[PDB]
Every structure is written in C-alpha cells, then in structure tokens.
Symmetry: D2
C-alpha cells in the first residue's frame, strides 16, 4: 500500500490499538471529502487504506482520533484529534508512512517517504 499509518502510545510504551483513523482528500472546492478510514491493529498499524490507482497526487489529510483513545484508557486528553496534512507527489515510486507518537498533552508526527 502507498499510504500507511502507525500510532504509538508514549505513556504506556506500546502501539496505540483500535485507534480510528480517517483520511480525506481535498476536493476542487477546497472541502474535505472521505477517502479512506480504519482502526489501528494490535501492532498499532493500519494497512490497506488505499491502492496505487486510487492514490493520485493532491492534498491529503490524515485524522487520528486520539481523544477517544485516551478517554477509553480513562486518561484526560488535550487535543480533539491529531491532524496530518500533506501533498502526495509522484516524484518516482513512493510509499507514505505517517508515524504518530502520542501523549495526553503532546503528539509527534513524522512522515517516512521511501521508494
């Protein structure tokens, strides 16, 4: 898959499991429209979000429902969710891995782009 998502819990030191993830693509009128979604596996990963044919150039937004994740663990969260917005470009073969590291009042997100 050209687009992969991996979430980690910095508090417990483990993958963040069963975390809802929504992907959106920016439409011609600048509104966001559903593209893909799913929940992280037991490894904190979410694969098979899309395919090469479907994944065309453009601006994409990846939304991670961190709020629910924390509520579920009985921990008070600051953010409503963790957003990641980027432009997918066909500069040769490219796989996109959006890595997110979570804490109740802080999160880190990194993009690993490999060929």
């Amino acid at each position: 898959c050209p687009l992969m998502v991996k979430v980690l819990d910095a508090v417990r030191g483990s993958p963040a499991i069963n975390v809802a993830v929504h992907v959106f693509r920016k439409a011609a009128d600048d509104t966001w429209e559903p593209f893909a979604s799913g929940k992280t596996s037991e490894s904190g990963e979410l694969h098979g979000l899309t395919t090469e044919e479907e994944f065309v150039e453009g601006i994409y937004k990846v939304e991670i429902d961190t709020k629910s994740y924390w509520k579920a663990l009985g921990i008070s969260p600051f953010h409503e969710h963790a957003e990641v917005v980027f432009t997918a470009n066909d500069s040769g073969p490219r796989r996109y891995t959006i890595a997110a590291l979570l804490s109740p009042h802080s999160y880190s997100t990194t993009a690993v782009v490999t060929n």
Copy 2:
C-alpha cells in the same frame, strides 16, 4: 495573554522566526471561523493573539504555516502546515501555550495549560 504560540527550528536549534499563525474557532454551524492571526517574532514567540474577554469557551484550531517557513529557506517540506485543535476554557479561563518543534518531515506539538 491567554493564548500564546512558540515555535522552534529543530534543524538549526533556534527559534523559528516569522512563522505565520492562524487561529480559528468552531462556529455554531461546525465551520471554522477566523479568530486571530499573527507571526512569530525573533524569539520564535507570538503574543497578543487575543484577550481574556474575547477568548471564550469553544473548540479552537491553531494553524501554524510550517510549509511557508521551510519554503522560505529553500527547503521542500512534507506537511502543508501543523494544525492544533482543542477545546478551551471549558472549566473556566486558562492560559494556553502551544509549542511546536519543526523539522522538514516531522513536527511535535505540546500544550502547556496553567491558571491565571
């Protein structure tokens, strides 16, 4: 100052200067309405975005224009911007400091919440 934003450059190890910042508040119709904007100073900090009187309860979005920052220095970043969304003042007024650490392909954001 109830809402402050601080940005650092992780590559250079210095304050990220002139970083444009846009704040939005979710309207009673679920669309993002402009609330305030500014640019970081030489210390990488942005003060005076709003006031206690005007900073009411609500869901806020702090948009840091990271892309313009990196492009402004010959670098082609991954993210379009960094957006921090959170509910504020739902337990009474608080002072919020939104910190962001920037790298071309990665960013970190922390929120420091204290009382007045």
Copy 3:
C-alpha cells in the same frame, strides 16, 4: 530478538541507514561494558542484537552514533550521540524496541515494550 533498535531521520523523512549502534550493560562496579553492536539496515533497523539467554535483567545503555550519521550527510550536528539508558525487567515476556527520531539539534527516543 528481545532487543531491537529503529532510527528515523526527521529531516529527510526516511530511515537512518548505516548508523552505528552500541549496547552496553552496567557491570557490578558501575562501569559500562560492551554487550552488542551493529549498524542500522536499509530500513533503519537493527535486529539480532542479542538472545533471550544473554539478555538478563539489569541496566542497559543504547548509544546511537548520530554525529557520524549527520557528518556523512554533510550536515552539522549538535549532539555527540544519542543515549538511551533503561532497566530490563522480567515482568513476563518482553520485547524491547528503542525508537529514535533524529534532527540536527533535536532527537526523540521512545521505548515500545510488548509481550
């Protein structure tokens, strides 16, 4: 393997490859002694550092030669290296993954402990 290491470059957005990694164990006299070492693969990972029998409880230090990594890319680094010190405990099955995200003047390290 009970101990794994993964390094990412936050500047280029890819795994940090061919990065030297040294593991040490704290001896009875508090000095650090060689335990294991290697260089990250093309995936930015370093496996097979040790085995269950060898990996006993105690205090371990994982040293990542980030300085060389940056020098090699013609980029000026701040830190001499990135250290990670922790206590390995036999609280039931445990695999240790030390994740490091690198930037010239900043680094993040997370420990993913799974069963």
Copy 4:
C-alpha cells in the same frame, strides 16, 4: 546565563517541577567530572548552573533525572534518565538552552544555541 535547562511534562501539559539535573564535563582522561547541578523550579526551568568564566570549551553531559521525577508521582518509567551530550563553546562562547519533553516511556530533547 550560558547554560540553561527547561523540562516539560507531556502527560500533564505543564512544567516539570523539581527535576534534578547533573552536568558533567569530560576530563583530559575521558572520565566524566562533576561540573554543576540543580533542580528545576516551578516554571520547569533551571538557571544559574554556571558562569561564562567557568563554562569553557569541552564535551559536556547534561543528566536529567527523569526516573526520580516519575517515581515521585507514582509512575514506573522506562528510562533511567535522559542524558544530553555535546561539545560546547568550540567556536567561541554561546548560550545553550537544553529543553526536554517528558513522558513515562518517551522523551524529546532539543538544544537552542544563540549568541550573547
């Protein structure tokens, strides 16, 4: 103040108070020699660790006792401490700010280097 250390709590979103900090300088025999120590205040900052006159060239180690911090609040952390090692003043005197963001199983450290 040529060397300052700031620590934040990523779980709570507040300054990490009373965090013990030990600084060492590599001696001409490759062993770590005590240079200075202190604890973070209520703002999570530690000032006055050393002076311009005493902070000479060298390889320094800043040891932040994260474990004691987390244990002091009923939490069993992963790391023993966070150690920041770096060469300082090799291009003339600079002001260094070592920042650290703490979580029970993870930490981030950034170095801000500026001129006087």
